[PDB]
Design an enzyme around this catalytic site. Sequence first.
Site, PDB file in Angstrom:
ATOM      1  N   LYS F  12       0.779  -1.232   0.000  1.00 30.04           N
ATOM      2  CA  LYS F  12       0.000   0.000   0.000  1.00 30.04           C
ATOM      3  C   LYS F  12       0.818   1.294   0.000  1.00 30.04           C
ATOM      4  CE  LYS F  12      -4.007  -2.240   2.015  1.00 30.04           C
ATOM      5  NZ  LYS F  12      -4.771  -2.550   3.251  1.00 30.04           N
ATOM      6  N   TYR F  52     -12.265  -3.464  -4.717  1.00 33.34           N
ATOM      7  CA  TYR F  52     -13.053  -3.451  -3.494  1.00 33.34           C
ATOM      8  C   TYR F  52     -14.564  -3.565  -3.708  1.00 33.34           C
ATOM      9  CZ  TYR F  52      -8.705  -1.942  -1.202  1.00 33.34           C
ATOM     10  OH  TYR F  52      -7.430  -1.863  -0.699  1.00 33.34           O
ATOM     11  N   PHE F  60     -16.652   2.971   4.819  1.00 31.82           N
ATOM     12  CA  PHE F  60     -15.298   3.374   4.463  1.00 31.82           C
ATOM     13  C   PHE F  60     -14.914   3.362   2.986  1.00 31.82           C
ATOM     14  CE2 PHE F  60     -14.977  -1.136   5.976  1.00 31.82           C
ATOM     15  CZ  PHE F  60     -14.649  -1.726   4.762  1.00 31.82           C
ATOM     16  N   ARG F  88      -0.661 -14.586   4.410  1.00 33.37           N
ATOM     17  CA  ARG F  88      -1.410 -13.746   5.330  1.00 33.37           C
ATOM     18  C   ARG F  88      -0.857 -13.860   6.749  1.00 33.37           C
ATOM     19  NH1 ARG F  88      -7.132 -12.878   5.503  1.00 33.37           N
ATOM     20  NH2 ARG F  88      -6.760 -10.809   4.583  1.00 33.37           N
ATOM     21  N   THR F  94      -5.098  -8.187   9.807  1.00 36.35           N
ATOM     22  CA  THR F  94      -5.389  -7.003   9.006  1.00 36.35           C
ATOM     23  C   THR F  94      -5.376  -5.756   9.891  1.00 36.35           C
ATOM     24  OG1 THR F  94      -6.736  -8.369   7.542  1.00 36.35           O
ATOM     25  CG2 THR F  94      -6.958  -5.988   7.335  1.00 36.35           C
ATOM     26  N   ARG F 105       2.972  -6.531   9.506  1.00 34.42           N
ATOM     27  CA  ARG F 105       2.162  -5.504  10.146  1.00 34.42           C
ATOM     28  C   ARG F 105       2.547  -5.337  11.607  1.00 34.42           C
ATOM     29  NH1 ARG F 105      -2.443  -7.909   7.215  1.00 34.42           N
ATOM     30  NH2 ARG F 105      -3.068  -6.472   5.539  1.00 34.42           N
ATOM     31  N   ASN F 115      -2.418   0.081   7.260  1.00 37.91           N
ATOM     32  CA  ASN F 115      -1.832  -1.229   7.544  1.00 37.91           C
ATOM     33  C   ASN F 115      -0.811  -1.707   6.508  1.00 37.91           C
ATOM     34  OD1 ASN F 115      -3.648  -1.758   5.535  1.00 37.91           O
ATOM     35  ND2 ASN F 115      -4.559  -3.550   6.521  1.00 37.91           N
ATOM     36  N   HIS F 118      -1.460  -5.643   1.677  1.00 34.58           N
ATOM     37  CA  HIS F 118      -2.630  -6.467   1.406  1.00 34.58           C
ATOM     38  C   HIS F 118      -2.235  -7.849   0.878  1.00 34.58           C
ATOM     39  CE1 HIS F 118      -6.121  -8.183  -0.609  1.00 34.58           C
ATOM     40  NE2 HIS F 118      -5.384  -8.217  -1.706  1.00 34.58           N
ATOM     41  N   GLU F 129      -8.064 -11.257  -7.996  1.00 33.60           N
ATOM     42  CA  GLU F 129      -7.167 -10.121  -7.875  1.00 33.60           C
ATOM     43  C   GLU F 129      -6.022 -10.188  -8.877  1.00 33.60           C
ATOM     44  OE1 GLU F 129      -5.918 -10.210  -3.830  1.00 33.60           O
ATOM     45  OE2 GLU F 129      -7.858  -9.604  -3.016  1.00 33.60           O
TER      46      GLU F 129
END
Lengths: 151, 151, 151, 151, 151, 151
Positions: F12, F52, F60, F88, F94, F105, F115, F118, F129
């Site tokens: 990100k 998304y 959000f 993950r 997350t 993270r 965060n 992804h 994706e």
Amino acid sequence: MANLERTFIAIKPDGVQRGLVGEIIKRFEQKGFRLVAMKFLRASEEHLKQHYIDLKDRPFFPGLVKYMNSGPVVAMVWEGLNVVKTGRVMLGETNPADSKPGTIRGDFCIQVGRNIIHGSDSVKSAEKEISLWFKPEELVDYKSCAHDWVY
Amino acid sequence: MANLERTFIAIKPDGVQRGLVGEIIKRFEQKGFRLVAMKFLRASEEHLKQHYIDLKDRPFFPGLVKYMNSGPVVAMVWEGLNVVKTGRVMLGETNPADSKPGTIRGDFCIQVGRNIIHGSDSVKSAEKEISLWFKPEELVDYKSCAHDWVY
Amino acid sequence: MANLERTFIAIKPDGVQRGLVGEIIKRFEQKGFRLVAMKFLRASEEHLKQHYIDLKDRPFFPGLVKYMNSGPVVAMVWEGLNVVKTGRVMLGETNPADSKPGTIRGDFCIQVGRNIIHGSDSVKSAEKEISLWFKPEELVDYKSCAHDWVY
Amino acid sequence: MANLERTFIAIKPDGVQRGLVGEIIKRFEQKGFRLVAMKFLRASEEHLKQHYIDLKDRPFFPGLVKYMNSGPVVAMVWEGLNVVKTGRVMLGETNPADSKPGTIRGDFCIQVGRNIIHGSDSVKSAEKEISLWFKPEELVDYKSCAHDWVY
Amino acid sequence: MANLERTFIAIKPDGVQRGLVGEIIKRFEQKGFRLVAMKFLRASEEHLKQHYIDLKDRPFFPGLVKYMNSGPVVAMVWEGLNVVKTGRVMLGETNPADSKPGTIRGDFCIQVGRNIIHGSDSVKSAEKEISLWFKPEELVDYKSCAHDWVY
Amino acid sequence: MANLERTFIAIKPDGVQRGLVGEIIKRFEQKGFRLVAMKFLRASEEHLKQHYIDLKDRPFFPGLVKYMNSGPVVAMVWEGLNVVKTGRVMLGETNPADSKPGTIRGDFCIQVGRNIIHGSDSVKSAEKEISLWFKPEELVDYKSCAHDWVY
């Protein structure tokens, strides 16, 4: 061888802001030098003018003082055989452009204006700076457990 | 181319004591050199005198022997194109005072007395040392999976 | 001062295969340089011949082309004051044998054949390569949050 | 838421002696927390008894005080969303035996007696300690350049 | 406590091949555990069957032996308070799939077949393995300079 | 087993801005996963809305879209046994507040809003994706030299 020494190492506002405090301290530790004193503070313009007296008649002086007051710095004193000379070698050239890879400046910065750190240029300057930045009761005297393995 | 090589790398008592074994091995690994052999042992004064025969008529010799026997060392053999020459460069000057930042000595030690590591000065010395420190059945022969990407 | 710059840095097949992508990128990040563009691809022999036009007469050329096509590469563009000059300094000598410890090549490779990375030799070359490897819409323009602390 | 916070982190004598200052500071920096204040000192037995008032009747108390006075400590204040809770998570269990790998204690120490570091157990305790260890003019207020990227 | 300990740690062929020797040793060093002994060797199938006697009637045994003989390993002995228990925690689950990030396996491997390292499951197994892999004169006895700072 | 896999990992804007690209990639490399595809780009709000879609009716969403378009991201595809699940785990929860030290993270971020990274929640999502972010010809297929040592 002939005798040890002592030196004043200061992490400038940009070095703090870019999160290089741990990296810088770590390097000195892994070298075998010992942390005599350390404090975090925003050096006042007054205190800084004193630190840069020898450059009060230089074009940049005003900017340099405003600069070093823009953010907090980490002031330290490191002890060890030839700390002043080797310490500066570890710091790299004052101008990041000439600092060789492997050094603090050579690894972390680009412009002289923002050269992240300061190291005393000589033992005579070292003691001066140490007195200007630290109070004698702030210099802690202890013995590193690996001292006999470094010396 | 012209041909590969092989060298004798030894991590002195102070290097072991200050916890620099992993760091030193790691550095040789990331370079592309291959670990031919490695052992942990406290070199006897007798064995050490043999290692330092060319310096048995030098003042420091007695201390040097007492020194290297004070604690265990990590003896190793590293293979690679020009290992002896480059390996020493990776080690830095024998005098930590001249070792440039980025080198093992330059990053981890201060005094020549305690310069944490030893590397063969030449291929001729390498082979001598390898024989003096290792038994022929101790040099393992295998092939690194990334060998064709290094050479 | 005088003006910033922009350079083309490419991580060769061996660099990718030996898992040095993160290390190499990390180094440029910690220096203060900014990633303008980055893509992962297997450069076709055609595209590579174009990249090596100035060497299409030398004996190694056909091998060099076959070589660089043997695996995927990571092509990038880094911006900063003097990126071309300092970037190469960070890379080390093109011949890993002369690359000093502390540099990418000096730390991670041995043979010139497998020197893990490429950096533009000049601003003139940099722009050429950047055009040859990237499309103008691929060069992202944004501002590093610590820009004023690097400059 | 709900609100940020502020916590007191102290690197114990053993943490300093074993050269883990840089590692510890670095970790907090890389997390996104901000260094509000930092000083190096040998906490007097008196000052320490005050710090450990809630334990001045336990079997260990005297030893603990003698202990923490044996060498210099690094006292710090870190700011950030939930610093107290997460900070302690980063520190690991107070008993190194239960500290999970990845944490400061879990990575660097073995015995509870020598658990290298201290983190406030709560916001209430945090402010207490901060007052006991720092003078209000020592807490530097500045803004991290990446604040908007952490928040 | 109750008493210290000692454990047998072995870096499997894949760990050596993928260059994780330095990283793994380093991790044990920074924790405060002391290297009692260490050797590099290609364990013979015969020696390996002895090591895996408790699994000689298990399906995988044949392969497991062929496996561990495919390349050299790094056999070591680490001393410390609870080395066996904590050492395994540092290793992570035997099945990389369950090894949590921060642990050797959790950070460096994926499949149980290639789980890069081995640690004794208990003090009883530890002593057995130590005897099976090392000769009594190979376990070096010295004292770490930071021992009193760890305990 | 059962089968390998493949997953979509995206760094990100904040992760890029805070210079954690090399660290993040490095981590996947050292685990044994292979980089199938990687590109640096500023994802348009359109492209992001598509990414998304399942959250277009959540509060959000508008902010999340504006957010992810605020700066360039590093989109990648990693191959390996169970990449989605373990990937993950490496990323951490997350919500950085629940991410354990040792994870990306858990080591580098504080707030859920920022965060830094992804990872696909499932193989079904992963392929979606991957198609949404990459063009088939962008997924490079090669073989890691240490593949047989990871599997």
